[PDB]
């Protein structure tokens, strides 16, 4: 199971907005590296904390977004969530 989908599941199961993915793109046009950014809106007892997670730069957006999700999961596990 992919970390991108696990983060989606976690987000609905807790009645959260679905996570949003953006991308920073660096380099000349013939070599673009992508950094994944995922935003999760953490709702805890009716108040919201915004979680912004990045991964490392990858050559494929898909791998870059996966790693962003994987960072979000890391943080959410460490604060006792699933």
């Amino acid at each position: 199971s992919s970390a991108k989908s696990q983060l989606y599941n976690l987000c609905s199961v807790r009645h959260w907005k679905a996570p949003l993915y953006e991308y920073i793109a660096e380099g000349p046009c013939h070599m673009k590296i992508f950094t994944g950014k995922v935003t999760v809106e953490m709702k805890e007892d009716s108040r919201i904390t915004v979680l912004e997670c990045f991964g490392n730069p990858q050559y494929k957006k898909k791998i870059a977004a996966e790693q962003a999700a994987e960072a979000a999961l890391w943080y959410l596990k460490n604060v006792g969530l699933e």
Partner: protein
């Protein structure tokens, strides 16, 4: 500093702005960065304003 973890959890800094990147020993955090916690694979922090 170091803190082995059993079955504890961490608090959410409720209502602020939290950021997590992969951690690399020669990373640079921005001015407003306040490290919350990290292992040796990721790091979490927040901003001042």
């Amino acid at each position: 500093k170091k803190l082995i973890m059993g079955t504890g959890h961490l608090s959410i800094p409720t209502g602020q702005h939290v950021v997590c990147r992969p951690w690399n020993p020669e990373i640079t955090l921005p001015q407003d960065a306040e490290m919350l916690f990290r292992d040796d694979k990721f790091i979490a922090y927040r901003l001042v304003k």
